Design a binder for this molecule. Structure first.
Ligand SMILES: CCCCCCCC/C=C\CCCCCCCC(=O)OC[C@H](O)CO
Ligand SMILES: CCCCCCCC/C=C\CCCCCCCC(=O)OC[C@H](O)CO
Ligand SMILES: CCCCCCCC/C=C\CCCCCCCC(=O)OC[C@H](O)CO
Ligand SMILES: CCCCCCCC/C=C\CCCCCCCC(=O)OC[C@H](O)CO
Ligand SMILES: CCCCCCCC/C=C\CCCCCCCC(=O)OC[C@H](O)CO
Ligand SMILES: CCCCCCCC/C=C\CCCCCCCC(=O)OC[C@H](O)CO
Ligand SMILES: CCCCCCCC/C=C\CCCCCCCC(=O)OC[C@H](O)CO
Ligand SMILES: CCCCCCCC/C=C\CCCCCCCC(=O)OC[C@H](O)CO
Ligand SMILES: CCCCCCCC/C=C\CCCCCCCC(=O)OC[C@H](O)CO
Ligand SMILES: CCCCCCCC/C=C\CCCCCCCC(=O)OC[C@H](O)CO
Ligand SMILES: CCCCCCCC/C=C\CCCCCCCC(=O)OC[C@H](O)CO
Ligand SMILES: CCCCCCCC/C=C\CCCCCCCC(=O)OC[C@H](O)CO
Ligand SMILES: CCCCCCCC/C=C\CCCCCCCC(=O)OC[C@H](O)CO
Ligand SMILES: CCCCCCCC/C=C\CCCCCCCC(=O)OC[C@H](O)CO
Ligand SMILES: CCCCCCCC/C=C\CCCCCCCC(=O)OC[C@H](O)CO
Ligand SMILES: *C/C=C(C)/C=C/C=C(C)/C=C/C1=C(C)CCCC1(C)C
Ligand SMILES: *C/C=C(C)/C=C/C=C(C)/C=C/C1=C(C)CCCC1(C)C
Ligand SMILES: *C/C=C(C)/C=C/C=C(C)/C=C/C1=C(C)CCCC1(C)C
Ligand SMILES: *C/C=C(C)/C=C/C=C(C)/C=C/C1=C(C)CCCC1(C)C
Ligand SMILES: *C/C=C(C)/C=C/C=C(C)/C=C/C1=C(C)CCCC1(C)C
Ligand SMILES: CCCCCCCCCCCCCCCCCCCC
Ligand SMILES: CCCCCCCCCCCCCCCCCCCC
Ligand SMILES: CCCCCCCCCCCCCCCCCCCC
Ligand SMILES: CCCCCCCCO[C@@H]1O[C@H](CO)[C@@H](O)[C@H](O)[C@H]1O
Ligand SMILES: CCCCCCCCO[C@@H]1O[C@H](CO)[C@@H](O)[C@H](O)[C@H]1O
Ligand SMILES: CCCCCCCCO[C@@H]1O[C@H](CO)[C@@H](O)[C@H](O)[C@H]1O
Ligand SMILES: CCCCCCCCO[C@@H]1O[C@H](CO)[C@@H](O)[C@H](O)[C@H]1O
Ligand SMILES: CCCCCCCCO[C@@H]1O[C@H](CO)[C@@H](O)[C@H](O)[C@H]1O
Ligand code: NA
Ligand code: NA
Ligand code: NA
Ligand code: NA
Ligand code: NA
Lengths: 273, 273, 273, 273, 273
């Protein structure tokens, strides 16, 4: 079967197919994904007035990200169930091309909302010291866009051309490291002149940010993290990838948003935790 | 026909099929389910300002659970009608694998929202005495997650491997008992220093919690509660399971939420009930 | 063919089929139904602040019923168009079992929201004199539930077993009469110590309640109201049943809610009609 | 082919089929339709507080009509694309009876919301002089209902029985003329004792009302406005009908609502235009 | 294969078909499109109170455009995936006429909302000096309508009749130039008597407006921008067209709306950036 520049899910699905557990788990984990985002949307809107006016733009940008993540994860949850269909004879779910091939790239282009807005929103909670708002924003948005576009191109070749996959992935990684560098500066400057309570929260936000964002390139490589014909080049790797995405999605978007809201509360004059 | 690690609904549906009453009832009871959750969402939002600011987070977390439960019960209602199709010759609804096998596991992963948030929200209404907020929260969330994940694994084997089904179910039960233990403490400490009216409501909340949460392991075992080849290993057991889920869903989420809101009103300075 | 315990719509649809007028009218009347409920939801939310705080729970419960009625009528509108498909050869719409059989029972289980909440909400507008709030509520909810459950069982046999249909219907009717009895008391006690304007509205509410609620058992019997092989055991009876439901739905839920809102305004200190 | 009492769209679609332009335009014009109504819903809600409390009911009734028109135009937009399917051999869209026949009657029953509420809402902005509120309302609602029901019956026969089509249309027209008569009185009485600004707006509202409402009987007759085998008994007439509906829908509902809101602002003590 | 007056996407799709990258990218870029508009809707509503009352109509009109753009881009995203289906034998997505032909004209009719409202909303932020509000509005709306209708007609012939395509496009362009002329005046007059900060924002708005609006005629011509049998008369041109639309949509609607909101804040007495 000719699949071309398609994600490895389609190759596993076309050859071995997916067990009940693999198929039902991947559907459920994506469903949890979009459910968390819509619940988060409600949470971020309803808690707007829990912080001083100046901090409320962070609640609004969290809500903006929730809308993006909900729409994408909802669409992708339906894409999963449309792309793989039960074969009665063998009792496994095989590629159903009438549904279209499954593509993780769907996520990447919506990151053009998520990444820029997640990086931007912290600049409405913390105060910079030596760095300029417009400068940090421009660095975040440029490197964010380049990271996403290069990775988007790469993931199309994860089976068809491992070399292109790894080269584009490496270029994307360079921009990622730049973002990590700039966010560390923002966290450091953010800690300057705020309560120890606020500083603790920013320490947690940095760890959360570092781990949650690194999970995305982890998901990128997932099928090959056990090498050629490894344990993960299987339905187990398919499950692992969507699980990692969902953990990353909840952590990078919702928990990040909640911690920023808690920081905003400590920095708020009237409010306290 | 090879169904593998699938719920017993698919076996009944593939062999005997479902009568009009069994099929139509299961569809209607799931439809009532998601209708209650969306109505509950509206109720919890519209009554936010009926309690003092400090208590409003409980309304918000109720709303969060309503969103999760609505999305899941809506999706599962469609899953039911897609998985079983009318056979004109015999006049019963049989497994339609083109719709996918039906899986109750869909519910379990969304409990990673419901369970943590339901257990958390009471800590925004009652005041603890001897117990520490962070400690109760961490115990609820850890044991909640472990209870859900172990049960999720178990239910895949409810037909294919009764031993795995019962062992995973037993491990899950251990974590459940821990949750019951911690919640009893929270209720007791919550009663200390509040009006007799508030204490009565917490007594009711404990009974509701105990019964409603115990229904879930009841739903887990449903097909085997009348032993091998029992009355319940049938379309009658299929009906019973979804009925028990719906009673549990309405009770554990909505009625629990309403009682907590009523408690918040008694604890509120301005409000009287 | 073998339809078993199915509503008469499926028998007419399987034997005679439906004319363009019968099929298109039934679809349109259900569409009007769900449109009225969603419009009503908007109305009840937007007019919350038109009455004193104490009366606003009635607006909220109206909104809750609108959500239930919208979801059900929307789902049932789609169920109608899925269950009957055009036959080009004869130019009529015949039963399409791939869509499932059509079941009015879908409505009944959602009444477990509508009936309890419609009966409850008046107790937030009128003041009782001799009767106790908790007692009236408990009688409404018990008899409401029993009325619904017994009728739900009955309607499955409306073709397959006329005896069961009529016996279950009669038992259901007994609980209905109890509800009528209790509501009459509530209306009388509500009239005590309020303006003549408020008393006139409660008189209207009683007439509306009596007629609108009686339409439901009317819909139950519809196919047999012209006896065996009567005018109504036909596509004309199918049209009549859904028309009666829609009139009953609009009257019992929306107009009832509007009149209660108008009563709340007269009873409100600041507000005036 | 046997189509029975069906609209002429189905006859054109079954015999000639629709060109790319005819099919794509009819889909797009209905899509614009429902888009305008949902945008209008947002506008009428967001501008509620731009007028004195007493006038806000008019914003609410505008919103109610937006919900009705959105739901109907959305459903009808999907009905269009389901009822006509591309034939590769000839390159035109032909009747696809599996989707159901297309029926304009779908619109008519939703007018039982639109007509009564559009006629009602002006009575919350203007003050009557010689006429009684309840009397004008009752005349509007009775004649409105009769106009709709008689026309609804008529449109089923627009091909199958031209005589019935014209007779029912004529009866409907009589009730329409009554509505025009009553609305002219309302406008005249509304002009009495208000600013020149308010009087100008009521003059505009009358012209808008007269033209926009007359478009509906225009749409009714559309296929025959160029006589037997005329230019309009074609895909061009199909396009014209839905175009006229969309112009009528936007004019009679949204622009009417906006002008009433502007009138409310001029009549408002605090507010200025 | 006879496609008639259809867009070039259908010809490429019917002859060469689309690679995984071409098909998946076009789906993702449209998905990003509608996601941005729904996120924008939330943003424009939530930031209404960030500007003085007089400026809030601009937030409302932004929201109005978001609803239109969301609905259209969502519908068009589904139209893309319905119109092209995977062929297992060659591994490309080919025209699936059962889904309907793909038409960009769908966008054009919704511009009857977007264009008039985008041009209107600036007149609620800037103050005119020489020019009259009603006059600028009328010129914008007339030329906007004529630009859209002439272009709408043109795009049907982009393959079937290049002459009609170019002539209608040229006529449309004339009206576009008129709009550019009037908007330049509005921006110049808007700069008069406001802070240098506000003037800088209007300079940005003019560049954004000029580039973003010019992208639409760019999308119109896209397939022929590399001449006959050029690089762009291919799946690469199909990708380019939808990419350009999405850049234009985000830029002309959301970024334009955000900049107007920022201008409104600078012009607001209480508020500051
Ligand atoms: C191929 C391997 C790629 C190598 C990895 C590259 C990582 C660093 C990239 C860019 C550094 C700075 C780029 C800045 C982009 C312009 C935004 C900006 O800095 O302007 C702010 C303005 O001055 C208002 O203060
Ligand atoms: C600019 C980056 C382009 C990299 C393309 C690439 O690495 O291609 C590998 C080659 O095709 C392996 O056969
Ligand atoms: C955050 C929670 C995620 C939980 C989800 C679990 C998914 C497991 C993912 C990665 C583990 C694999 C790490 C790779 C270490 C194995 C290295 C190896 O096996 O060798 C490579 C091979 O030999 C060279 O050819
Ligand atoms: C089958 C069971 C039906 C569940 C009933 C309603 C579901 C919708 C949730 C709305 C809950 C309303 C409860 C209520 O009205 O309580 C008032 C309170 O006591 C004063 O604050
Ligand atoms: C709620 C879940 C509660 C689980 C209930 C009992 C657990 C018993 C402990 C597990 C012991 C295994 C029993 C077993 O394996 O018996 C099945 C046998 O193989 C038949 O064929
Ligand atoms: C706390 C973390 C749980 C750790 C280990 C539990 C492992 C439980 C696995 C039990 C499997 C039982 C089984 O596989 O049954 C044997 C055989 O198949 C009968 O037919
Ligand atoms: C077969 C024929 C059936 C006839 C049933 C007729 C009426 C049912 C009346 C039963 C009402 C009792 C309900 C229990 C109740 O609501 O108790 C009162 C409340 O608790 C005080 O506070
Ligand atoms: C739970 C209530 C159980 C309800 C019991 C169902 C009664 C079924 C019935 O009345 O049917 C009679 C006859 O078998 C029809 O032909
Ligand atoms: C709360 C009250 C519960 C009591 C229910 C008993 C009534 C059940 C009535 C069932 C009727 C059975 C029947 O009519 O059977 C007919 C027979 O099968 C040939 O016609
Ligand atoms: C609303 C509902 C109100 C219905 C009340 C009417 C009669 C109740 C008395 C029970 C009637 C039992 C008689 C059974 C019967 O009539 O059977 C006919 C025939 O033998 C089978 O096809
Ligand atoms: C809007 C509808 C406006 C209707 C106006 C038609 C006037 C009279 C119809 C009388 C029926 C005449 C039928 C004779 C022609 C025929 O039946 O052929
Ligand atoms: C291509 C991807 C680009 C899509 C990004 C826009 C995200 C959509 C809405 C958020 C509204 C914009 C929020 C900007 C805040 C500006 C401000 O706060 O000043
Ligand atoms: C054919 C080519 C025509 C292109 C002409 C461009 C300007 C068009 C209209 C200006 C109207 C001025 C304002 C109209 C208000 C009514
Ligand atoms: C200002 C409003 C313009 C109104 C009418 C102009 C109509 C003229 C546009 C029609 C052009 C038709 C055409 O170009 O046809 C070419 C021919 O078909 C090649 O073979
Ligand atoms: C936005 C609308 C642009 C309208 C006209 C631009 C066209 C002007 C260029 C002249 C077109 C003549 C032409 O390109 O001739 C076709 C030839 O076959 C190819 O080589
Ligand atoms: C909620 C969305 C978020 C936080 C998105 C984050 C995305 C990344 C950190 C992506 C990084 C990548 C690399 C570093 C290399 C491979 C390609 C990417 C784009 C997955
Ligand atoms: C609204 C969601 C709620 C309250 C979820 C509750 C879930 C449980 C109490 C689950 C318990 C289980 C066991 C104790 C054993 C079998 C497996 C479970 C997970 C069903
Ligand atoms: C909006 C929902 C409402 C008001 C529901 C009302 C339902 C009833 C009054 C049902 C009554 C019935 C009988 C008295 C006999 C036959 C069975 C029932 C349930 C239809
Ligand atoms: C937004 C909905 C509106 C304003 C509906 C208006 C409907 C009419 C004015 C209908 C009139 C008709 C006639 C006068 C004759 C033919 C049948 C009708 C119902 C189309
Ligand atoms: C968000 C919607 C916007 C900004 C729409 C803008 C539309 C145009 C500027 C269209 C211009 C065209 C021409 C100048 C020639 C070809 C036809 C058109 C309509 C695409
Ligand atoms: C369905 C069987 C389970 C019901 C359990 C009832 C709750 C008892 C705990 C106290
Ligand atoms: C308090 C408000 C009172 C409202 C009274 C106004 C009456 C409007 C109700 C309309 C009912 C029309 C019934 C038509 C009967 C069907 C006949 C159709 C002819 C074939
Ligand atoms: C300054 C005004 C010019 C703006 C640039 C618009 C470019 C439109 C061309 C479309 C892009 C073609 C990509 C192949
Ligand atoms: C940095 C992590 C990337 C390590 C590269 C591992 C090389 C994977 O090797 C690939 O494995 C596939 C599935 O097992 C095989 O089908 C391919 O033939 C093979 O190229
Ligand atoms: C706590 C309740 C669990 C007790 C275990 C019950 C044993 C059920 O045993 C199983 O029953 C199935 C259906 O009856 C049969 O098809 C299986 O062959 C049998 O293993
Ligand atoms: C109180 C109202 C109940 C009246 C019961 C009427 C009995 C109807 O009798 C039924 O009529 C059907 C329709 O033709 C027939 O098909 C059935 O064979 C017949 O039993
Ligand atoms: C405008 C109100 C009067 C219209 C009456 C016009 C008579 C139309 O006449 C009809 O035209 C159809 C289409 O050409 C034909 O198919 C029918 O045979 C014919 O009866
Ligand atoms: C301003 C830009 C207008 C340039 C129009 C000239 C291009 C028209 O060239 C067209 O190319 C198509 C494929 O490329 C062919 O199928 C057509 O037959 C041919 O007319
Ligand atoms: Na599937
Ligand atoms: Na089904
Ligand atoms: Na149908
Ligand atoms: Na179609
Ligand atoms: Na497709």
């Amino acid at each position: 079967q000719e699949l071309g520049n398609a994600n490895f899910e389609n190759f596993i699905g076309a050859t071995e197919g997916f067990s009940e557990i693999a198929y039902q788990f991947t559907s459920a984990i994506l469903t949890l994904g979009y459910a968390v985002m819509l619940a988060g949307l409600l949470y971020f809107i309803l808690t707007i007035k829990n912080v001083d006016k100046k901090f409320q733009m962070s609640n609004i940008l969290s809500a903006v990200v929730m809308v993006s993540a909900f729409l994408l994860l909802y669409a992708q949850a339906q894409n999963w169930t449309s792309s793989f269909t039960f074969n009665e004879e063998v009792g496994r779910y095989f590629l159903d091309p009438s549904g279209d091939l499954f593509n993780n790239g769907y996520r990447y282009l919506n990151w053009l909302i998520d990444v820029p807005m997640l990086l931007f929103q912290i600049l409405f909670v913390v105060s910079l010291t030596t760095s300029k708002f417009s400068s940090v924003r421009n660095q975040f948005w440029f490197s964010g866009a380049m990271m996403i576009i290069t990775g988007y191109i790469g993931q199309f070749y994860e089976v068809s051309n491992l070399t292109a996959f790894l080269v584009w992935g490496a270029i994307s990684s360079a921009f990622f490291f730049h973002i990590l560098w700039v966010m560390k500066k923002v966290i450091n400057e953010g800690k300057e002149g705020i309560s120890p309570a606020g500083q603790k929260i920013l320490s947690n936000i940095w760890i959360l940010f570092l781990i949650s964002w690194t999970l995305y390139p982890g998901a990128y490589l997932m099928p090959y993290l056990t090498g050629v014909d490894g344990f993960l080049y299987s339905e187990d790797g398919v499950m692992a990838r969507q699980l990692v995405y969902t953990i990353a999605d909840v952590s990078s978007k919702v928990i990040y948003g909640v911690l920023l809201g808690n920081l905003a509360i400590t920095l708020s004059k009237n409010k306290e935790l």
